[PDB]
Amino acid sequence: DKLAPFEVFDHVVNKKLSFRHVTMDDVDMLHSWMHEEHVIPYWKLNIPLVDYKKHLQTFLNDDHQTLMVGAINGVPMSYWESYWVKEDIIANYYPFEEHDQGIHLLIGPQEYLGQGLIYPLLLAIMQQKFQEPDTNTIVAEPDRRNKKMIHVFKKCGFQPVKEVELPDKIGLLMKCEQNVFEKRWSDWKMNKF
């Protein structure tokens, strides 16, 4: 049931985008990303390496989600959790459909921030998640304070629904319907985003 690895060219940014499954060999790198100042407030995983290892192992053995590393021209610089809403905490907050999916993400290295690279990456992984035939909706619940990500999500087709009082944050529940997404993905690829 896991999201498959993939590699695509993006002609807009003129880069190779590649996504692979996370493994335990990634623990030091991922641990470093979790200690970045732009990540800490939203992920809260600035914890000792020993603990991060135990957490990563548990998530890698979790069947409702797929952990991936996203890379630009082979350089790993983003972390992704792709999941089924039905088996996730967010299912409790809205009348989800059976095959709805969700996405969590971060850009790790500072050297990959501020360059608009989240768009081609997010559009690519969304496209591959939407190839599940019965999935019509993908949801996201960014912290309500993460104005930049709320903006990025809106630009990719996500519509805000309502705040969600989650254990770790007040999120903004947002839904992206496939027909809207394909139009935005096509706008992107046709240089009219």
When the beta carbons of 28 and 168 are compared against Cl ion, the nearer one is 168
Stretch touching Cl ion by CB under 5 A, among 3-11, 67-75, 90-98, 112-120: 3-11
Here's the x/- map for Cl ion, 118-147, by CB under 5 A: it reads as ------------------------xx--x-
Which strands form 6-10's sheet, in the order they lie side by side?
6-10, 15-21, 65-72, 75-84, 101-107, 137-140, 170-177, 159-165
When the beta carbons of 46 and 136 are compared against Cl ion, the nearer one is 46
Out of 97, 132, 141, 182, which one is annotated catalytic? 141
Instruction: Verify whether residue 141 is a known catalytic residue.
Output: yes
DSSP assignment of 94-126: S---TT-EEEEEEE-SGGGSSSSTHHHHHHHHH
Stretch touching Cl ion by CB under 5 A, among 5-13, 65-73, 108-116, 130-138: 5-13
When the beta carbons of 9 and 59 are compared against Cl ion, the nearer one is 9
Task: Find the binder of Cl ion among 42, 43, 94, 193 (CB under 5 A).
Answer: 42
Length of the chain: 193
Q: Please name the helix (run of DSSP H) or strand (run of DSSP E) that holds residue 52, with its range, or none.
A: helix 49-60
Alpha-carbon gap, residue 64 to 137, rounded angstroms: 16
Binding residues for Cl ion, rule: CB under 5 A, are: 8-11, 42, 142-143, 146
- Residues labelled catalytic: 141
